[PDB]
Structure formats: C-alpha cells, structure tokens
Amino acid sequence: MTMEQFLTSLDMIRSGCAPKFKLKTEDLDRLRVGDFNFPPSQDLMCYTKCVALMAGTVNKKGEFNAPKALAQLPHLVPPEMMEMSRKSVEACRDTHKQFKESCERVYQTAKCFSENADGQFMWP
C-alpha cells in the first residue's frame, strides 16, 4: 500500500469497529495520533482489540502473534513505515503476557507500540 491508501485505511478500519462501542471522539482523535497518555475506558480498550482482530495480529483472547504480525505488515503499513513497525513488533511482542484480560492485552500492546515507535505512530 501507499502512504495515501494507509491514511484512508485508518478511517475504514475504525468504521467497522467504532459502532460496536460507546466511545468519545476526543479519545479516538488522541489514539489516531499515537497519544495513549490518558486513562482508557473498557470500551476504548476493547475497541483496540477489535482493530487488531481485523488486522489479524491477535487471537480472540488478545494474545499478540508476533510471527503473524510480521507476516501481515505489508497489508497493514506502507514501505515508509515497515522498519518502525518491525522494531515495535519486536519491542512489544511480550507485553500481552503481563495481562490476563483480552481487551487489556491488546490495548497495552498498542500503548507499547506508541511508546516504542521511534517515529509518528497512528492508530485507526
């Protein structure tokens, strides 16, 4: 995918997940720019799970599949974002083990991605 297709993909992914939850627009805006520096609601955490499930990077128990994530990357991010994404997958591959609940596992892995992103991070 191109950068242009990626940016638009963010909205398309959000549209298939956001209606399932009660979410604040201001929280979604902050995740969109990689700002995870605020307390999430349960809804917001499960929203992040719905997104990762769509991407095929976690199972229904929210366990992060780092081999599959790396295999999926070309269908998720453009070339310009591959190396940053690969690095973040490696840094955050074990975050899910600290947590037991599925939504929480995904949210904390996403939060780790944002903090280990050596550049601009964007979430659907």
What does this structure look like?
1-propanol binds at residues 52, 57. Keywords: Behavior, Disulfide bond, Olfaction, Pheromone response, Pheromone-binding, Secreted, Sensory transduction, Signal, Transport. Butan-1-ol binds at residues 52, 57. Belongs to the PBP/GOBP family. It is a single chain. The radius of gyration is 13 Å and the shape is globular. It contains six helices and no strands. It has a single domain (1-124), classed as Orthogonal Bundle (Recoverin, domain 1), CATH 1.10.238. Helix 3 crosses helix 6. It has 124 residues and is an all-alpha fold. The longest helix is centred in the last third of the chain and has 15 residues, at 102-116.
Number of helices: 6
CATH topology: Recoverin, domain 1
Strand content: under 5%
- Please trace the helix and strand order, writing H or E for each element: HHHHHH
CATH homology superfamily name: Pheromone/general odorant binding protein domain
Number of strands: 0
What fraction, in percent, of the residue positions are helical?
Answer: 55-70%
Q: What is the name of the CATH class? A: Mainly Alpha
User: Rg to the nearest angstrom?
Assistant: 13 Å
For the record, the count of structural domains works out to 1
Second CATH tier, the architecture? Orthogonal Bundle
Sheet of most strands: none
